[PDB]
């Protein structure tokens, strides 16, 4: 694909999801979210093959049906209402439409297993951009609408996210499902905070896009796609690894790191709402999420799996390439804690 | 679901035992049909006759679990004229599991079953007692 | 605190900075130096604690558990220093930088004045653990050993958090001068129940209690010297510290919540003992040891009198000090023969004396032999058990005798009977390891001859 | 050692003093900023949780095709 | 075989090179001086210096004003025929019972 | 949205002209100086990357991180200051608005209050 | 999420077509212009919660 | 030592819990990858949520 | 040489420095926690003629 076409593709899409988080009627937001599709999806067919074919179907047919159930749910409260203005929708029925269809959007269980599909299926650059701003959106329109939300409907959804990103991810030994499935589990947590404070939500959500753009780079740059890939790394440059162990612990949520602040605000607030049983389980249920965290890092960094012999090669030759901001990113990803009261900022 | 659970809401803990069975049979069974309707969805059967049969397994079980359940929790409840006190609750959740357990003919699943859903109806009456919500309506 | 606190953030650039061959030199020399800064902190009043600032305060309890931190860093980096020869400059500077953030957390855990920068710190001591562990220990079981470790650590600590957050909304404050100022009684209820059930089995499972202890075999075993170390000397305390902090609020549902815990914590203490006298690896030996002594400490904090914070103060001192030295001789055994089996080495008593002498020294401190802080420890538990209930002492009585015979029968073991014929690679035993040994004995005997300086704020 | 390494018992007495006025201060105004959202997302009539209504500059008062509006 | 792995090394002995070792580091003058600054660092200073300032800390915990005060009140009070010890720690003129 | 909607907010509007009147954070602010570290580090770890010198190459990269944590920390203070004053001004307010919502109660002595006690034994 | 782009610049995208009391071609009065005018009115500037109420 | 500490203590709270975890593991992602499977999941959770949820 | 020990040994002053830091901002951490000096009820006392606080 030219270079030209690459970059006003990768222009429309973020056009589009601006037009999603400027516009205040119904049909433009709509209009940003078919856009948004439109353009992404030959950036998931940029490399062609079977597998990306497939991956941009599946994507393709998920976005559409939610998009379609979207606009049902814009005509049904137009309906009752007679209004257009993103607000707080004036019909259960039509609520309950719309948050299906951003839920099927956002991958949320049970819309998730287009998630772990299309990301096995594409690259790391298209998962990257996937997962960032693809959440980026519809939890903008969420935020919006967050006042009409079911609390009883968001609350499974979240929880069932979260149980089925910890044992998905459990199970698999590739890196992108591995991270589809986090990116589930870490969805689950944002939504689950929403229907309470849509500051925590839009502070789960960067705190996120800062881990998870910091691991998609160390990927890249290790070139990397299985965890076995991911285990010659050491020998060639094993400060790579070092750092993607940090932010592995990070990403688990244990401290000082900054992956505790979305959990620990978040548990809060829910508390502060009288409730405990839910941020209980959801803190319990992230042990899963830890535990192949921790199972990726031994096999990364912890210990030192066999090598090659053309490693040497490897050795001889350099790093050409650079992915700037990865240093930020390392560094806001893990070390950002004591400027937690910056949320407030955030408000 | 809301019509089901409201129904055993209203039907009083030590009273009426026939009624408590019934509406725990049916909140099992609704339970077993929604089981078995997904898996039916993302494992399907090579056969409908297979299909019918592994929905009729699924919807048994749930219901006998159901069903034991409220019976043990109204029987244990009237028998020691003592209601509101969570032990009922672990005791159907015990008999529950080991329903579950001879279901799927396994001694160890019985066992980690009785524990964790006597544990669990425990908690279940703890709540109603206290006034412990899930899904806490937003404030503050 | 700052002036404990910055030197080790100093110490860090220091390690990093150093020339490849002075790294030792220089992290051992301003180790020392830090724990006679802060042997400072013993200077407590009789009324209140020290409250230096908004965030950090001293007491009678936080001052020995920090002397204990600031003395036993240098005593890892000489174990470290005598395992670590053939590792790569960057590699020993990574070692000693992960132990100079296990004692800067320590520091900062221990004068922590909130219960939530408390949790964070004290939750943040498991990532320099975990490393050490998971990547210098020696065997095939260290990634098993970190699992369960950390896993049984989180477990425990989750629902301590969300109790500490919940609790921060209904009071209004975590700080631990107004929880103490402003404590209300705790109605018998089962929000309550289920709130001290978050508290205390959080500390309980970092103990650990019995029934919760296997992460402490696997990782003690498993670890490095480095991290056996402190592992046992002050990250079983953080428990103990904790549930003496905690309890405050907890009254008077502790009278009632504690007969479970008690009694799984005297006949685990009986267990422990027992699987001691038939262990068939020396650290797993004085891993079930330190279970015991715990215990123990668990059995005092719960039937929580004035009387038995004291001797669980001393005790978890003394424990630290003992166990420290146990594991540094035991890991001179191994660092000779290759080999963590009990009876595969013997004679040792003919075949390295003065090694030997230290051998029945930390024997002797390790059973309750009089004067010793051991023994001033375990002989106030025993004391306030028996007023707390009057068959607590055949229970402390058994336990006691169990104590006696493992040890002796280590020491026998190890030392005494005829050496073994084809093991040739014993050589004499180093300077090094003989300083250590004196360096981890000689304060046990002169805190025995300074008693009130490890009884705590009771005192 | 008194007189180089330590001060006297009022510096310790008068600083836990005036900790723990400012812990006590920051306490009620928890407790009392929980009241304050409490009442403003039950209520609506304070500056926080003000959802967006429609701006009524939009409508159109010219007269019609329709005299009945 | 599976692998092109080096054998296991055997164990090197720091007295073969440095008859008088200390077991600090392998160079010699290195690990004398590491010997002299933990011996005299740790053993002199610490112990030593820290000891003697734990034996002669000030007497903060007014064990001493504690006594004192107590020979005072019990002197007064036996003087006086007041009880040595009060049978109330507050005053029951200033504790307003509930009726 | 607690704050969002607010009376006369502009939109994307970091830093209103009412932040003017609150006291803006000394530049030796530790929360700068913190800002100032994570930059320091940022250029350690863009060092370690490349495979230069950590602590020698760079100096003029390392300084520019430097700079613009600092700079971008300055004005990440001010504006959460100024939503923390804002915050505590619309709550006082309100107290003031709400008096009976919010009133002054009795206050009684511990002689007068009764207490419970739960002995130890 | 709403990054009020066209209130911060005076712009005006689709608050046209947002309600149908707005300017309409040829001055065409919607079928509900009144009632919608009124409420529009009644719950200018008291927020979602007071307005519902 | 083998009975309680190294049998049951063992099974009670580590290996029954790792097992649970692995046996929904395997059931969650033993998925075919088969978008008619899953979408006719879509249409059964659409309905449960029109119905169940009021 | 003084340069080549000075290169050697100039990290040995890293603790020291740290320490005197330390113990400056300790006591500009207590300078800040002067609300009730010479303001308790127990140890309230009138100024001598040549003091202006009673502690630092
Ligand atoms: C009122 C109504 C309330 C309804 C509440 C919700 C209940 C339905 C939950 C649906 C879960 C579906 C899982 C499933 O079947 O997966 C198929 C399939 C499992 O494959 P399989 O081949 O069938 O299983 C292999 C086994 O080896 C096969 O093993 P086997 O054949 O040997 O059989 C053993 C096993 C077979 O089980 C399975 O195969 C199912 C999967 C394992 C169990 C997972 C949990 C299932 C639900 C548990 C009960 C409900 C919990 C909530 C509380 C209810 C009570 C208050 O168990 C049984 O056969 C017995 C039936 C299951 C237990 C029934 C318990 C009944 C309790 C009755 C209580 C009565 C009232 C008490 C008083 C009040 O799963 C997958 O392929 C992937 C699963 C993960 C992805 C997510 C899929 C579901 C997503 C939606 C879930 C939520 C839906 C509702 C909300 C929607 C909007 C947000
Ligand atoms: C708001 C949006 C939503 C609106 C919804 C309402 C819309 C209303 C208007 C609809 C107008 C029509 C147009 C839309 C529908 C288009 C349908 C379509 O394209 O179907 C193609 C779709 C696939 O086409 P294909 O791949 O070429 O055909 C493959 C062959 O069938 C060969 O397949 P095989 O060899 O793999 O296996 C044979 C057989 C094997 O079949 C099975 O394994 C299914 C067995 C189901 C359970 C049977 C009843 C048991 C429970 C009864 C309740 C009381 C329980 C009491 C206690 C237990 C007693 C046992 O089929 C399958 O395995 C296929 C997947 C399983 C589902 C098949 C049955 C679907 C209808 C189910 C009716 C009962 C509902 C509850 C079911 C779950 C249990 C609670 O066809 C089917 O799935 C079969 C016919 C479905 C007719 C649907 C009629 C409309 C339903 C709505
Ligand atoms: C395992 C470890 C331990 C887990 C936690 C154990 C304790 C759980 C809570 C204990 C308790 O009191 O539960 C019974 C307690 C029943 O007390 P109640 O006085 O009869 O409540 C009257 C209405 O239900 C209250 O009115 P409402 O309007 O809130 O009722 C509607 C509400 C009703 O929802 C419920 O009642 C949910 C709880 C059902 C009983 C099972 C306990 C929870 C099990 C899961 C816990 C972990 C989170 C997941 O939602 C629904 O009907 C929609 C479906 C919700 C269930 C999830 C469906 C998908 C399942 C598959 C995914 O649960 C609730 O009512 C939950 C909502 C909060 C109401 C506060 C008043
Ligand atoms: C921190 C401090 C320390 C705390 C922790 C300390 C350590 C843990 C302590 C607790 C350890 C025990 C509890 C957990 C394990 C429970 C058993 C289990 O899961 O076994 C799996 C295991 C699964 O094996 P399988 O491959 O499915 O079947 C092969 C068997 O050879 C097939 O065997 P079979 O067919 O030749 O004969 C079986 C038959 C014959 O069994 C007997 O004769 C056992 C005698 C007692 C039966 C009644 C048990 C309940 C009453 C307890 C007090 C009995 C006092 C006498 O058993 C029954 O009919 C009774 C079924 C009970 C179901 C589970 C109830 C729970 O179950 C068995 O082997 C059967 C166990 C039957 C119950 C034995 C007693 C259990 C302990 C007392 C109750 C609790
Ligand atoms: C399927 C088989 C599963 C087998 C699991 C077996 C687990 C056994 C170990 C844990 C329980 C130990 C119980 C000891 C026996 C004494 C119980 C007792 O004192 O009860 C009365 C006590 C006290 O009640 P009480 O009877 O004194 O009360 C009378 C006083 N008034 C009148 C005021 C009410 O009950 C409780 O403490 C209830 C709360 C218990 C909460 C759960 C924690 C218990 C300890 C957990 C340890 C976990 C690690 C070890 C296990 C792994
Ligand atoms: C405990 C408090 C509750 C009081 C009692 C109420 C619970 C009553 C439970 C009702 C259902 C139990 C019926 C028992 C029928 C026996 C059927 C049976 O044999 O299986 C039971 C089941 C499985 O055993 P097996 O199939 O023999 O193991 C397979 C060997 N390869 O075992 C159990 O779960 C215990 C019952
Ligand atoms: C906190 C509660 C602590 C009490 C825990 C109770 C668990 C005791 C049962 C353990 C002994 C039974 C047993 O050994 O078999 C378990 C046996 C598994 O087979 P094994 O091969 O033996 O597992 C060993 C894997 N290496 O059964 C199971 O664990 C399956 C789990 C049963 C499902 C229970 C689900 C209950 C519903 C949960 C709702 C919440
Ligand atoms: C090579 C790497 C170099 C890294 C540091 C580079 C920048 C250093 C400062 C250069 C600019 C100096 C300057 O203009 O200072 C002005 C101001 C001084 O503050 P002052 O006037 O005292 O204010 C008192 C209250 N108003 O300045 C300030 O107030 C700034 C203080 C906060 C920001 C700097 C924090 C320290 C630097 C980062 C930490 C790590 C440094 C490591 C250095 C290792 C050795 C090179």
Redesign the interface.
């Known amino acids: 694909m030219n270079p030209i076409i690459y970059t006003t593709l990768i222009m429309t899409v973020m056009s589009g999801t601006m037009l999603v988080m400027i516009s205040s009627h119904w049909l433009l937001i709509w209009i940003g979210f078919e856009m948004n599709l439109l353009a992404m999806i030959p950036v998931l067919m940029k490399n062609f093959n079977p597998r990306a074919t497939e991956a941009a179907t599946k994507y393709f047919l998920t976005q559409a049906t939610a998009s379609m159930m979207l606009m049902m749910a814009i005509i049904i409260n137009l309906l009752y209402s007679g209004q257009w203005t993103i607000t707080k929708m004036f019909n259960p029925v039509a609520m309950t439409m719309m948050t299906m269809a951003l839920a099927m959007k956002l991958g949320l269980s049970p819309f998730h297993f287009w998630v772990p599909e299309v990301t096995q299926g594409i690259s790391l650059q298209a998962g990257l951009l996937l997962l960032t701003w693809q959440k980026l959106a519809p939890l903008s329109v969420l935020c919006q609408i967050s006042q009409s939300i079911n609390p009883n409907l968001m609350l499974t959804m979240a929880m069932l996210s979260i149980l089925i990103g910890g044992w998905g991810g459990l199970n698999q030994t590739q890196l992108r499902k591995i991270m589809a499935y986090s990116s589930i589990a870490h969805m689950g947590w944002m939504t689950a905070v929403l229907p309470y404070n849509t500051t925590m939500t839009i502070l789960n959500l960067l705190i996120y896009i800062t881990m998870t753009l910091a691991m998609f780079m160390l990927l890249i740059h290790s070139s990397a796609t299985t965890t076995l890939s991911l285990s010659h790394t050491w020998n060639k440059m094993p400060v790579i690894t070092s750092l993607m162990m940090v932010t592995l612990l990070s990403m688990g949520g244990l401290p000082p790191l900054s992956g505790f602040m979305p959990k620990w605000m978040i548990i809060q607030e829910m508390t502060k709402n009288e409730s405990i049983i839910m941020p209980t389980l959801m803190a319990m249920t992230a042990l899963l999420n830890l535990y192949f965290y921790m199972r990726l890092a031994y096999s990364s960094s912890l210990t030192m799996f066999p090598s090659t012999n053309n490693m040497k090669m490897k050795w001889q030759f350099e790093h050409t390439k650079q992915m700037k901001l990865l240093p930020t990113m390392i560094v806001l990803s893990t070390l950002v804690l004591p400027m937690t009261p910056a949320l407030s900022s955030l408000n | 679901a809301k019509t089901l659970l409201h129904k055993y809401s209203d039907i009083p803990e030590g009273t009426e035992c026939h009624r408590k069975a019934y509406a725990s049979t049916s909140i099992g069974g609704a339970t077993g049909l929604i089981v078995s309707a997904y898996s039916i969805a993302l494992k399907p059967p090579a056969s409908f006759l297979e299909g019918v049969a592994r929905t009729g397994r699924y919807t048994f079980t749930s219901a006998a679990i159901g069903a034991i359940f409220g019976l043990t929790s109204c029987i244990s409840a009237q028998v020691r004229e003592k209601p509101d006190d969570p032990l009922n609750y672990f005791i159907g959740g015990c008999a529950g599991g080991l329903t579950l357990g001879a279901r799927t003919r396994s001694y160890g699943i019985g066992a980690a079953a009785c524990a964790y859903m006597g544990l669990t109806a425990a908690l279940v009456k703890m709540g109603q007692l206290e006034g412990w919500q899930v899904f806490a309506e937003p404030k503050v | 605190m700052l002036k404990i606190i910055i030197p080790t953030t100093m110490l860090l650039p220091m390690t990093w900075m150093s020339k490849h061959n002075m790294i030792w030199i220089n992290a051992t020399v301003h180790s020392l130096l830090i724990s006679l800064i802060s042997l400072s902190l013993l200077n407590q009043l009789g009324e209140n604690s020290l409250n230096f600032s908004l965030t950090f305060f001293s007491d009678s309890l936080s001052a020995p558990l920090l002397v204990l931190t600031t003395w036993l860093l240098p005593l890892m980096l000489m174990a470290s220093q005598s395992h670590l020869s053939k590792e790569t400059t960057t590699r020993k500077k990574l070692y000693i930088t992960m132990l100079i953030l296990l004692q800067l957390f320590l520091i900062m855990t221990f004068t922590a004045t909130e219960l939530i920068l408390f949790y964070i710190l004290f939750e943040a001591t498991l990532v320099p653990t975990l490393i050490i562990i998971t990547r210098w220990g020696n065997q095939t079981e260290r990634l098993n050993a970190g699992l369960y470790f950390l896993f049984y650590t989180l477990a425990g600590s989750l629902p301590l958090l969300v109790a500490l957050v919940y609790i921060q909304n209904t009071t209004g404050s975590l700080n631990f001068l107004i929880i103490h100022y402003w404590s209300h009684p705790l109605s018998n209820s089962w929000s309550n129940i289920f709130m001290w059930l978050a508290c205390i089995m959080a500390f309980m499972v970092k103990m650990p209690l019995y029934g919760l202890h296997l992460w402490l075999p696997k990782a003690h075993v498993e670890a490095p010297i480095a991290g056996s170390m402190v592992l046992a000397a002050v990250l079983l305390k953080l428990g103990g510290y904790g549930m003496m902090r905690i309890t405050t609020i907890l009254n008077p549902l502790t009278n009632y919540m504690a007969y479970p815990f008690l009694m799984l914590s005297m006949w685990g203490m009986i267990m422990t003992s027992s699987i001691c006298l038939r262990q068939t690896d020396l650290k797993s030996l004085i891993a079930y040891s330190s279970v015991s002594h715990m215990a123990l400490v668990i059995v005092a904090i719960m039937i929580q009198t004035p009387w038995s914070f004291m001797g669980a103060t001393a005790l978890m001192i003394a424990h630290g000090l003992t166990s420290s030295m146990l594991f540094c001789l035991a890991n001179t055994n191994y660092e000779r023969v290759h080999s963590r089996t009990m009876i595969l080495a013997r004679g040792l008593q003919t075949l390295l004396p003065l090694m030997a002498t230290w051998w029945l020294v930390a024997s002797l401190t390790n059973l309750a032999l009089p004067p010793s802080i051991n023994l001033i420890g375990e002989l106030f538990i025993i004391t306030a058990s028996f007023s707390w209930s009057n068959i607590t002492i055949i229970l402390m009585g058994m336990n006691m005798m169990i104590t006696a015979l493992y040890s002796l029968y280590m020491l026998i073991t190890t030392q005494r009977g005829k050496y073994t014929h084809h093991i040739n690679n014993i050589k004499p035993s180093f300077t090094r390891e003989n300083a250590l040994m004196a360096l981890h004995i000689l304060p046990l005997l002169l805190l025995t001859l300074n008693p009130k300086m490890i009884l705590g704020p009771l005192y | 050692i008194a007189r180089t390494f330590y001060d006297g018992p009022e510096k310790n007495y008068e600083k836990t003093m005036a900790i723990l006025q400012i812990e006590a201060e920051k306490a009620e105004l928890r407790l009392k900023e929980l009241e304050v959202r409490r009442l403003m997302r039950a209520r609506g009539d304070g500056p926080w949780y003000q959802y967006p209504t429609i701006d009524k500059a939009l409508i159109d008062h010219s007269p019609k095709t329709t005299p009945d509006n | 075989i599976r692998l092109q792995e080096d054998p296991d090394p055997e164990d090197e002995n720091l007295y073969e090179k440095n008859p008088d070792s200390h077991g600090y580091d392998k160079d010699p003058i290195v690990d004398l001086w590491n010997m002299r600054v933990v011996f005299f660092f740790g053993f002199s200073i610490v112990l030593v210096l820290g000891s003697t300032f734990v034996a002669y800390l000030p007497d903060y915990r007014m064990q001493e004003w504690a006594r004192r005060e107590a020979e005072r009140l019990v002197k007064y009070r036996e003087a006086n025929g007041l009880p040595l010890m009060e049978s109330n720690c507050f005053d029951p003129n200033k504790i307003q019972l509930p009726e | 949205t607690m704050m969002s909607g607010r009376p006369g907010r502009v939109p994307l509007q970091f830093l209103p002209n009412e932040a003017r009147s609150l006291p803006p954070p000394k530049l030796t602010d530790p929360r700068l100086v913190y800002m100032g570290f994570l930059g320091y580090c940022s250029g350690l770890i863009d060092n370690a990357i490349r495979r230069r010198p950590v602590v020698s190459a760079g100096l003029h990269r390392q300084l520019l991180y430097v700079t613009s944590f600092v700079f971008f920390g300055y004005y990440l203070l001010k504006r959460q200051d100024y939503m923390y004053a804002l915050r505590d001004h619309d709550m006082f307010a309100y107290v003031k608005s709400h008096p009976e919502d919010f009133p002054e109660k009795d206050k009684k002595t511990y002689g007068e209050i009764l207490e419970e006690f739960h002995p130890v034994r | 999420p709403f990054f009020d782009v066209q209130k911060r610049l005076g712009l005006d995208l689709d608050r046209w077509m947002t309600i149908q009391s707005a300017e309409q071609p040829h001055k065409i009065p919607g079928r509900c212009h009144a009632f919608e005018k009124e409420w529009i009115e009644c719950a200018h500037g008291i927020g979602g919660i007071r307005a519902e109420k | ?1 083998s009975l ?2 190294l049998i049951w ?2 099974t009670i ?2 290996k ?1 819990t790792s097992f649970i ?2 046996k ?6 033993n ?1 075919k ?1 088969l ?1 008619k ?10 309905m ?3 119905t ?3 | 040489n003084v340069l080549q020990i000075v290169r050697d040994h100039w990290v040995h002053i890293l603790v020291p420095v740290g320490f005197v830091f330390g113990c400056y901002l300790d006591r500009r951490s207590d300078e800040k926690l002067t609300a009730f000096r010479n303001k308790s009820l127990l140890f309230k006392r009138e100024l001598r003629p040549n003091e202006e606080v009673t502690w630092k």
């Open positions: 030592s309680l500490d203590l063992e709270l580590p029954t975890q692995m929904m593991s395997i059931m969650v992602s998925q990858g978008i499977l899953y979408f006719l999941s879509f249409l059964i959770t659409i449960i949520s029109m169940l949820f009021n």
